[PDB]
Design an enzyme around this catalytic site. Structure first.
Site, PDB file in Angstrom:
ATOM      1  N   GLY A  62     116.504 -98.461 -15.935  1.00 51.09           N
ATOM      2  CA  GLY A  62     116.652 -98.225 -14.507  1.00 51.09           C
ATOM      3  C   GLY A  62     117.951 -98.765 -13.909  1.00 51.09           C
ATOM      4  CB  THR A  63     119.492 -98.208 -10.541  1.00 51.96           C
ATOM      5  OG1 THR A  63     118.252 -98.206  -9.871  1.00 51.96           O
ATOM      6  CG2 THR A  63     119.953 -96.765 -10.673  1.00 51.96           C
ATOM      7  CB  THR A  64     121.569-103.284 -11.944  1.00 54.07           C
ATOM      8  OG1 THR A  64     122.064-102.763 -13.143  1.00 54.07           O
ATOM      9  CG2 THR A  64     121.404-104.780 -12.155  1.00 54.07           C
TER      10      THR A  64
END
Lengths: 225, 330, 243, 234, 240, 235, 249, 234
Positions: free
Chosen positions: C29-31
């Site tokens: 996932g996106t940070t």
């Protein structure tokens, strides 16, 4: 699609029914069992349904006792309903239909038992029948179920006469069992025995399910020691 | 490619996947049976597994993975032989990971056949070592046998550690004197701390586990001591009496009575000591022996197959009778 | 060897491999990160721009629960939406029954219990998200990270997603160098720096920095987005620092 | 041929030994109580149980299964007979209900059999003293004497040597303590043994006096001191 | 002969990597194996025809009926009469009578077609259910209509449709022959012509059954004598 | 040989009753023929074991009501349940509608139970067929029907369900003609006689035949009449 | 979260193996060691004490939230050995069971009826193929008014028993052997000190002496059972016990 | 030659964190004919290419009306588009009678995500195999949403879904600044959509029955055009 349930009963000790010109004769043999397993109990071979009807069983007591109790309940209900006791044909058909249902319905299992229903009623007189896991039933002059069925039916066929007395049917059942016994002698503790006869002298149906001493007495009549 | 593969196989042994671990152990034993676990580097100190072997395993793999063949792959015999010699310097790293996997597998619900196979690969690794890698591995194993977290479960795989120790002492009798005096000290410590003081017929109890470890290690090590029992024979006989006085739990009487069997058995038995891939750090079949002479027609040679064997001495026979009549009469 | 195919099962190690595999979904996932301030929480995320066609003001990665709980997540997008809806209705339930805003620790436990239940039965799978959430209540600032196993703890600063290694290492420097605790204004600037530093591993994709905060001094303890000049000031801080 | 019930029987054949013996004037049920740790307080779990004041049980196999079984068996002895008939069941009735509970588990998919075999012993006005074995199958058998668990083959050989139709309850207790002594895993004393009788009534253990109709428990668990008194001769 | 299997075959309720449910595809091609049914829709009526199995001379009548009445306005044809066909028909009958007593008005043919498809999505109460149906009827809104209701719980309206034995060449001759301008007589002759071609050139009242929907008489199955004069009208009209 | 490209299971489905329909061939022959003014059913008797009691044996041919008769091939135990269900339904109709059950309604209901034991899946179909025959109330057209384990039912001018019932059917097709059937009960009986004496698993215990005539005249021919009907020509 | 039909082999669902073992239940025992925390519980003269290790290596955690000691009701508490999600589940269950009992039966849930209830719930999870065992051991403590100082321990099989003392965790066998050798010496069933200040002091000493490591205030956790109060020590109160061990010897 | 072990069920995870069965349900969207949606500030438009089985067949329905202010389209699966579209109709009717509001198109999006994600989490079930383009108007203006069967929904100015959609999608991305400024003129937004769908017809050609169009916004209810009504847009 039930023949394995008919295989099941073939091991389960032996029961002989013989019909005379004046009565019926149930005999059955208990399998030899562990010294410490209790014998003085309700799970036997020769049971009863009403004062005019008796059964002998092959197959497991756990499948027998449900049907025996259903028969006792239905026979009590019939006597309560009509004040004349249930015909033998209606008892075996009622018990033949309950057993057929549990064989055709795949949500249930076939009852692994086969009872020899002896009885008397005035619509057909003395009536000897056999029923098996398939839910079919047949009327007989003599019959046997369970262990040594084949050997016993030949000895029945070659000695049975249609005119015979109840006392001749006592002899024939005891002598058949002593011919076809798995133990090389026969004894009162392995033997369960009953008769259905025409009263003391008057018109009533008289059952006896014999006590161990009366069995010893008919064995010493019949020359089995 | 093979020591890169041996390293990658050993790093991949699981404690949850007994089927994958069985197949990785098949690879490890097959590599070990053919390859010498030895460093083939001479005074070539400039070469190193990484920057010699791996650069030839990254170029070769990239060449064959992009659809080209090995027949097209051309390299100097010199870069290739430096990539081979540098392959052999990685073995001490692989063996540390291997002992660390062996002590993790003690806690696992394995099967008698996988446990037996894991013992066979540990013994075949050892018979393939030169004395330099063997002297490293022996100390690594002995150190982990004393300093571990590895016998916490109900019913551990003692064999995975104790058969490897017995195999060290089959190769080197000089290890047995210290390992046999350190074991009986720890058995005395556990017996004085109360192991085998609580009866049960059915089970080895959780407090008995270390006593069973040091006794099964003692049973296994003593079976391989031979002529080295002669140095500490009296000390073992007085220890055997102490053990037959002090512990009486019925599950332990079987384990503690195997001690005389192993002692007397090693004193009277005739059997092979040396199973090495190459004998005694000796002979000269060249450094190109990645295969163990398997196809080389010189496998049948008397100077290759000269095994030392073990033939019972007369001192070992005067001790076997002294143990036998002392303990039996006792 | 078949212990990893269904959700209730323990492996021979005594671990649930379907929850190990659910956290691999989180790691793709996106940070996203959170910072606990002297009086509040700051949340920040790398919003990857997938095309020009997405309506720019209506794709928002940071999620609002009640008015005092901020929320952000990494991994499966339908699973994050479902935990945020459970969260909104779980907070609205407590607000209807007790007439007072839910304690952040009590909210956290109601989610932890919900997510742990999805590890019990093989008739369901785990959630493929880690949630960073937090806020201000009667006891001051709280920051929580909740994972696929239902495990949660309170944090000083939290990081999840693809850039989490680099973000954790920077957040440790914030904690070491500011041991009294950060102001909300500096935590905003410092969060922008950590999202830009996390994006240098992923430079191939465009991103929008998204920041929100909930501080007892700057926002009256209501969760709000960092917009206009403060966002651009925090961008310009992250941009001089990334040089 | 094997299925899930043959495996539940193997859980029973691995479990700690227990036995039952029927005498002229009562019944014994008895077992070893095995401790997981010497810090465990062995009084705090009961191996032998009261079902009704005239019926008791002992098991072999999985102890937690037996504890849930006896909680259900007690609830069954209440909701069925105390709450509609006003009185407690014969041993036959409660053994059928215990077997009905055990058969329901072996039948339902997504459930496993109970990993216990039970010896249920008790008194009734019509049937007198009785002993029954109930297996994981949900099947029941009446016994003169029996044993279940690890020691059961040697125990049943000693019970076959020693049983006769004339034993008194006090001598059946001596046979029971001799049968437990041979199979003992731990120590043998009044703290490792658990032992009960169904015998004469005990009006003290009614715990109240006055109403002539009630007679108190036929069932009695022996205290550890009463066991140790018998062990001095045993 | 070679083998062309796949790892996603016999996967129930499972997508393949392509997004395919192969069970419903397999069920949807078993419609090629049954007895031939044909529907022709016109501005004058919908005609349903089916091939009949030959029977012993002693058979006086039977309850095998591949063309069935659903309502006065609606009739139906099967390629097979399994229990699932019976289930769909007695659902369609119960759906028709319940709509009649709710609105005092006849059910639309689309809405009845939708109802038998919903039964196949429910499986009675990604599985296929039952058998292909041709559904024919008239309503005041969308006129004379012919629908293929499929084991998938989905459907299409057709101007003409063949199902059962003969599929590729059965629908090939129908699209070649169909006009907006067909008269009812001409449509009957066309279903008999198609039936003759698929039957490996046999045609009697004993192997062809015909029916039509009109507003005026509703659904009716033709007498053997009515199909016999129609077969003679085919035999002379092709020879002319 | 529908392997084609080594194809298997391309339809993904099965439907099957026919194990029951095979038992319906194994079982005793049962044959029925209309006349102009009668219907005759005839059924094979099974040979009886040495020690049976014959006094209570069912006629195989089975009255449901004074105008309607049922006979069967297939499992005897199953046949009882259908006969009992048909008898309670016939009493239930006769009570609730104040008129006797019509022969087609009785067949539709017997077919209704064979349909439900097909459809429900948790039960097998009954291993039996039915030969339902008689006359409606206030009618003198003879009526004759079959049901099969599949729950399919059909009307017949003559019919035969048995193991060797393919040659009976050929003899029936050779001699029956729906333009001019056997008119009088004499011909009708003699033709079920000729059918039964051809291919039945016969012996000294042989065949049970029942004539039905209009207005509830139902009669099993005597063991002498089935012998009187043996009128022959031979060369 | 509903029950449904699904498949499994004899070690993926709780089913008897060919040898009568339940692998899914034995694997839940291995799940209890996962946190790498040891705990200890001992009985005083009129209290009962529970000591846990505390591990917080991650400098980014608020250490105040990391907690394996749980307050079930005013009288009774527990320590959990196993994963925190299962521990919070077992704690929420034990809190609800105790509240429902005090409502129905009118006195506070004894520690012998809570351990039994939680062990009966764990037996239902050991026979269910649709729901797993919990990876937890639960040690319950109170100073009952029926039995006095009480320790009860429950495990993933639904076994339970009462304890004189107990230790739970990765290194528990050494703590247990050192406790066994204490009671073999003193011959009491408890630690013979009249104040919870001396028992929490003796337990910390045995934990240090068994584990071979000293504790900062933050490396330990404490529970102190007294009649009508189970409570957990704050770090400045635990500091008193630690400062009373250094000054003593 | 390969055997994916982690794609048998919707509840398995891959060792890499993939739900393969949900990816295969996204692959089902590329089985249906192309649909395009686009929006400005005043209007939003759907356009769809309808397939048929045969030249005698009617055309398959691509566009559905959920309420007077919103509706959707259905590439991939037809029957999975009626389960979602029926539920979306129910939720619009419910919002009118319970709240006296038109359902917000964002609210409708969350309700679809909710319904779809539940199928992705439970055994025996299958993720939807249909992609919805939803258009609507509400107090926030004109809207377009792309729903994906995993349980996700996206706010877009325009998109295309179905077989060979990358052509129309690439035209919309290139034309964006133009079609988003088409305000107060609905016909030019329809023509921009019909030119976008013409980039996906690889050699094929629109016809009255092969083309369907829908529009919503400002003064215009949701309307569908197909048949002769699309004649001025061919």
């Amino acid at each position: 699609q039930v023949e394995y349930a008919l295989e099941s009963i073939s091991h389960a000790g032996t029961a002989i029914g013989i019909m005379a010109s004046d009565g019926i004769v149930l005999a059955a043999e208990r399998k030899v069992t562990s010294t410490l397993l209790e014998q003085d109990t309700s799970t036997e071979k020769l049971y009863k349904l009403n004062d005019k009807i008796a059964v002998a069983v092959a197959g497991l007591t756990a499948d027998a006792e449900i049907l025996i109790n259903t028969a006792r309940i239905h026979a009590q209900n019939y006597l309560k309903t009509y004040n004349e006791d249930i015909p033998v044909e209606i008892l075996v058909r009622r018990l033949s239909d309950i057993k057929q249902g549990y064989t055709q319905h795949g949500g249930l299992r076939p009852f692994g038992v086969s009872f020899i229903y002896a009885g008397y009623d005035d619509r057909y007189g003395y009536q000897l029948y056999t029923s098996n896991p398939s839910g079919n039933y047949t009327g007989w002059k003599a019959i046997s179920v369970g262990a040594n069925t084949s050997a016993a039916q030949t000895l029945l066929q070659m000695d049975y006469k249609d005119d015979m007395k109840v006392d001749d049917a006592i002899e024939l059942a005891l002598k058949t069992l002593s011919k076809t016994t798995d133990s090389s002698a026969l004894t009162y503790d392995r033997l369960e025995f009953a008769t259905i006869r025409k009263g003391a002298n008057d018109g009533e149906v008289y059952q006896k399910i014999f006590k161990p001493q009366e069995i010893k007495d008919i064995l010493v009549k019949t020359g089995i020691t | 490619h093979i020591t890169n593969v041996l390293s990658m196989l050993v790093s991949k042994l699981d404690m949850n996947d007994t089927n994958l671990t069985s197949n990785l152990i098949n690879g490890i034993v097959s590599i070990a049976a053919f390859i010498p676990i030895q460093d083939l580097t001479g005074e070539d100190d400039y070469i190193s597994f990484e920057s010699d072997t791996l650069p030839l395993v990254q170029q070769h793999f990239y060449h064959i993975k992009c659809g080209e063949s090995s027949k097209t792959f051309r390299v100097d015999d010199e870069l290739l032989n430096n990539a081979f010699k540098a392959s052999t310097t990685v073995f001490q790293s692989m063996l540390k990971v291997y002992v660390e996997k062996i002590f993790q597998l003690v806690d696992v619900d394995l099967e008698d056949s996988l446990v037996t196979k894991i013992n066979q690969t540990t013994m075949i690794l050892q018979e393939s070592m030169d004395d330099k890698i063997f002297n490293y591995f022996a100390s690594l194993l002995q150190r982990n046998f004393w300093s571990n977290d590895s016998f916490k479960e109900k019913d551990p795989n003692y064999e995975l550690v104790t058969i490897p120790l017995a195999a060290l002492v089959r190769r080197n009798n000089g290890l047995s004197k210290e390992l046999v005096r350190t074991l009986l000290f720890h058995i005395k410590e556990q017996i004085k701390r109360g192991a085998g003081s609580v009866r049960s017929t059915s089970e080895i109890q959780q407090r008995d586990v270390k006593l069973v470890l040091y006794l099964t290690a003692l049973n296994d090590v003593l079976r391989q001591c031979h002529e080295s029992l002669l140095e500490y024979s009296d000390e073992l006989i007085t220890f055997m009496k102490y053990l037959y006085d002090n512990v009486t739990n019925p599950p332990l009487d079987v384990i503690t009575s195997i001690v005389i069997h192993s002692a007397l058995a090693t004193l009277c038995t005739t059997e092979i000591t040396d199973c090495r891939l190459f004998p005694e750090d000796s002979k000269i079949p060249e450094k190109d022996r990645w295969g163990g002479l398997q196809f080389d027609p010189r496998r049948f040679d008397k100077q290759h197959l000269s095994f030392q064997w073990h033939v019972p001495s007369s001192d070992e026979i005067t001790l076997s009778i002294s143990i036998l009549e002392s303990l039996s009469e006792y | 060897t078949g212990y990893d195919l269904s959700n209730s099962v323990f492996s021979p190690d005594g671990r649930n491999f379907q929850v190990e595999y659910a956290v691999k979904a989180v790691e793709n996932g996106t940070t996203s990160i959170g910072i606990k301030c002297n009086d509040g929480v700051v949340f920040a995320v790398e919003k990857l721009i997938t095309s020009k066609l997405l309506v720019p003001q209506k794709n928002v990665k940071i999620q609002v629960v009640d008015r005092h709980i901020g929320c952000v997540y990494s991994g499966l997008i339908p699973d994050g939406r479902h935990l945020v809806n459970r969260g909104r209705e779980e907070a609205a339930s407590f607000k209807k029954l007790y007439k007072t805003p839910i304690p952040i620790p009590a909210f956290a436990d109601r989610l932890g219990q919900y997510v742990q239940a999805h590890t019990l039965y093989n008739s369901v799978r785990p959630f493929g998200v880690s949630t960073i959430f937090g806020g201000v209540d009667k006891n001051g600032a709280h920051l929580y990270m909740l994972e696929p196993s239902g495990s949660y703890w309170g944090y000083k600063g939290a990081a999840t997603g693809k850039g989490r290694q680099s973000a954790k290492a920077e957040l440790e420097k914030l904690v070491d160098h500011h041991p009294e605790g950060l102001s909300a204004r500096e935590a905003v600037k410092q969060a922008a720096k950590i999202i830009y530093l996390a994006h240098e591993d992923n430079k191939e994709k465009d991103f929008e920095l998204e920041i929100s905060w909930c501080s007892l001094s700057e926002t009256n303890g209501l969760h709000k987005f960092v917009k206009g000049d403060l966002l651009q000031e925090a961008i310009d801080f992250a941009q001089k620092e990334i040089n | 041929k094997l299925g899930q019930i043959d495996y539940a029987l193997t859980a029973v054949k691995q479990g700690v030994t227990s036995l039952g013996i029927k005498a002229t004037n009562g019944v014994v049920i008895a077992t070893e109580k095995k401790s997981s740790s010497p810090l465990a307080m062995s009084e705090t779990l009961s191996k032998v149980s009261l079902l009704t004041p005239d019926i008791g049980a002992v098991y072999s196999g999985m102890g937690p299964d037996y504890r849930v079984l006896v909680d259900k068996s007690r609830k069954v002895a209440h909701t069925s007979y105390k709450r509609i008939y006003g009185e407690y069941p014969p041993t036959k009735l409660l053994v059928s209900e215990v077997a009905k509970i055990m058969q329901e588990a072996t039948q339902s998919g997504g459930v496993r059999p109970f990993g216990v075999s039970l010896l249920i012993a008790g008194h009734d006005e019509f049937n007198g003293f009785s002993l029954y074995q109930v297996d994981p199958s949900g099947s029941y058998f009446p016994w003169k004497a029996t044993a279940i668990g690890k020691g059961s083959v040697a125990a049943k050989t000693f019970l076959e040597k020693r049983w006769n139709d004339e034993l008194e309850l006090e001598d059946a207790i001596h046979i029971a303590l001799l049968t437990l002594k041979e199979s003992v895993e731990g120590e043998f004393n009044g703290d490792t043994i658990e032992l009960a009788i169904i015998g004469d009534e005990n009006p003290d253990l009614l715990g109240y006096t006055g109403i002539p109709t009630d007679k108190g428990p036929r069932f009695r668990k022996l205290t550890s001191q009463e066991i140790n008194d018998r062990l001095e001769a045993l | 002969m070679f083998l062309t299997r796949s790892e996603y075959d016999r996967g129930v309720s499972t997508f393949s990597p392509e997004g395919r449910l192969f069970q419903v595809e397999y069920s949807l091609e078993a419609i090629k194996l049954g007895s031939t049914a044909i529907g022709i829709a016109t501005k004058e009526g919908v005609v349903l025809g089916v091939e009949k199995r030959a029977t012993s001379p002693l058979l006086e009548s039977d309850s095998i009926e591949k063309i069935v009445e659903i309502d006065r306005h609606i009739g139906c044809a099967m390629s097979g009469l399994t229990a699932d066909a019976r289930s769909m028909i007695e659902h369609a009958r119960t759906a028709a009578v319940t709509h009649n007593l709710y609105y005092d008005e006849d059910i639309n043919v689309e809405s009845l077609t939708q109802s038998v498809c919903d039964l196949a999505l429910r499986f009675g109460e990604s599985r296929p259910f039952g058998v292909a149906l041709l559904i024919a009827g008239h309503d005041a809104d969308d006129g004379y209509q012919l629908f293929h209701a499929e084991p998938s719980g989905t459907f299409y309206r057709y101007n003409a449709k063949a199902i059962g034995s003969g599929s590729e060449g059965a629908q090939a001759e129908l699209l070649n022959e169909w006009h907006s301008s067909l008269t009812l007589k001409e449509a009957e002759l066309l279903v008999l012509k198609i039936l003759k071609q698929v039957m490996e050139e046999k045609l009697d009242e004993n192997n062809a059954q015909l029916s039509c929907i009109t507003k005026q008489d509703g659904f009716k199955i033709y007498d053997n004598e009515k199909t016999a004069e129609l077969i003679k009208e085919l035999k002379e009209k092709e020879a002319a | 040989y529908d392997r084609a490209l080594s194809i298997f299971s391309p339809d993904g489905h099965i439907f099957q009753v026919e194990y029951a329909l095979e038992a319906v061939k194994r079982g005793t022959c049962a044959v029925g023929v209309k006349g102009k003014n009668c219907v005759v059913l005839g059924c094979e008797r099974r040979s009886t074991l040495k020690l049976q009691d014959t006094r209570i044996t069912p006629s195989k041919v089975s009255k449901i009501d004074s105008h309607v008769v049922l006979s069967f091939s297939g499992l005897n135990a199953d046949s009882r349940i259908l006969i009992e269900k048909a008898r309670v339904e016939a009493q239930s109709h006769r009570l609730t509608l104040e008129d006797p059950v019509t022969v087609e309604y009785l067949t539709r209901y017997v077919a209704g139970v064979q349909q439900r034991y097909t459809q429900s899946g948790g039960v097998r179909p009954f291993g039996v067929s039915t030969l339902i025959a008689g006359f409606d109330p206030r009618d003198d057209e003879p009526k004759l029907y079959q049901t099969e384990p599949s729950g399919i039912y059909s009307s017949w001018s003559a019919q035969t369900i048995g193991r060797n019932s393919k040659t009976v059917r050929e003899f029936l097709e050779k001699n029956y003609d729906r333009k001019e059937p056997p008119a009088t009960v004499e011909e009708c009986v003699k033709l079920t006689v000729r059918s039964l004496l051809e291919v039945v698993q016969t012996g000294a215990k042989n065949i049970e035949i029942t004539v039905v005539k209009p207005d509830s005249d139902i009669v099993a021919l005597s063991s002498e009449e089935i012998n009187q009907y043996v009128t022959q020509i031979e060369q | 979260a509903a029950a449904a039909s699904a498949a499994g082999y004899d070690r993926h669902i709780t089913i008897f193996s060919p040898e009568g073992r339940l692998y899914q239940v034995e694997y839940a025992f291995k799940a209890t060691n996962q946190t790498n925390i040891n705990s200890l519980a001992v009985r005083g003269k009129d209290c009962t004490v529970v000591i846990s290790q505390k591990k917080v290596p991650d400098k980014l955690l608020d250490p105040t939230t990391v907690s394996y000691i749980f307050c079930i009701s005013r009288t009774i508490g527990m320590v959990v050995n196993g994963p925190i999600p299962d521990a919070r589940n077992a704690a929420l269950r034990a809190k609800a069971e105790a509240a429902e009992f005090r409502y129905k039966y009118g006195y506070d849930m004894p520690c012998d009826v809570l351990a039994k209830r939680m062990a009966n719930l764990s037996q239902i999870y050991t026979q269910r193929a649709y729901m797993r065992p919990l990876g937890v051991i639960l040690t319950f403590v109170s100073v009952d008014e029926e039995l006095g100082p009480s320790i009860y321990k429950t495990d993933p099989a639904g076994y339970y028993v009462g304890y004189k003392a107990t230790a739970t965790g990765p290194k528990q066998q050494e703590i247990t052997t050192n406790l066994e050798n204490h009671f073999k010496k003193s011959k009491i069933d408890h630690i013979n000190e009249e104040s919870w200040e001396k028992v929490v002091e003796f337990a910390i000493t045995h934990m240090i002496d068994a584990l071979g490591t000293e504790f900062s205030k933050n490396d330990l956790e404490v529970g102190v059972a007294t009649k009508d109060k189970f409570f957990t020590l704050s770090a400045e109160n635990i500091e008193e016990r630690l400062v009373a061990i250094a000054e003593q010897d | 030659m390969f055997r994916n072990n982690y794609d048998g069920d919707t509840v398995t995870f891959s060792p890499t964190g993939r739900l393969f069965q949900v990816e295969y349900a996204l692959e089902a969207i590329k089985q249906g004919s192309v649909t395009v949606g686009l929006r400005s500030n005043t209007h939003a438009v759907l356009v769809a290419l309808k397939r048929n089985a045969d030249e005698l067949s009617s055309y398959q329905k691509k566009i559905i009306k959920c309420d007077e202010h919103m509706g959707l389209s259905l590439a991939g699966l037809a029957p999975d588009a009626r389960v979602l579209s029926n539920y979306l109709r129910q939720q619009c009717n419910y919002s009118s009678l319970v709240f006296n509001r038109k359902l917000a198109v964002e609210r409708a999006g969350h309700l679809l995500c909710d319904k779809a994600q539940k199928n992705t989490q439970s055994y025996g079930g299958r993720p939807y195999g249909v992609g919805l383009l939803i258009i609507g108007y509400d107090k926030s203006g004109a809207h377009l949403l792309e729903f994906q069967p995993s349980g996700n929904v996206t706010e877009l100015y325009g998109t295309a879904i179905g077989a060979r959609s990358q052509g129309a999608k690439t035209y919309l991305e290139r034309t964006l600044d133009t079609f988003i400024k088409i305000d107060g003129n609905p016909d030019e937004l329809i023509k921009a959509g019909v030119e976008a769908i013409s980039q996906s017809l690889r050699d094929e050609s629109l016809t009255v029955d092969n083309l369907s169009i829908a529009i919503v916004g400002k003064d215009t209810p949701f309307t569908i055009y197909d048949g002769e009504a699309v004649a001025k847009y061919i």
